[PDB]
């Protein structure tokens, strides 16, 4: 596979998100790290699919809502940033106020 350090690093994010994903499924209100991991991985898969930066900047704001996370969590996350390989190279996706 010849995995570079950055690919291996993103594997940490993917796994962190797997944890969050299962907890949300159980109906738990997510905490700070769970929320970031979940929304971040969402965007990474969006790029893998070939969605555009613009679409994801919008879709990222509809992954989790204020009623699905712990109190204070929405305010601890003013934005979420993640980079992934799109069909046209790496791009930076920034989602502002992802949880409303």
């Amino acid at each position: 596979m010849e995995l570079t350090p950055r690919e291996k690093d993103k594997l940490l994010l993917f796994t962190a998100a797997l944890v969050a994903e299962r907890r949300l499924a159980r109906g738990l209100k997510l905490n700070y790290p769970e929320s970031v991991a979940l929304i971040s991985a969402f965007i990474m898969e969006g790029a893998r699919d070939g969605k555009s930066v613009a679409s994801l900047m919008e879709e990222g704001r509809h992954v989790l809502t204020r009623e699905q996370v712990m109190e204070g969590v929405p305010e601890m996350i003013p934005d979420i940033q993640v980079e992934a390989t799109f069909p046209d190279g790496s791009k930076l996706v920034t989602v502002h106020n992802p949880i409303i």
């Binding site: 350090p5 950055r6 690093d9 993103k10 940490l12 994010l13 962190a16 970031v36 991991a37 971040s40 979420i80 940033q81 993640v82 980079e83 790496s90 930076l92």
Partner: peptide, 15 residues
């Protein structure tokens, strides 16, 4: 520290 290959030091995963 976020993504080492990113255009800024804030992108996830930050640890």
């Amino acid at each position: 520290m976020g993504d080492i290959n990113a255009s800024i030091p804030t992108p996830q995963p930050v640890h």
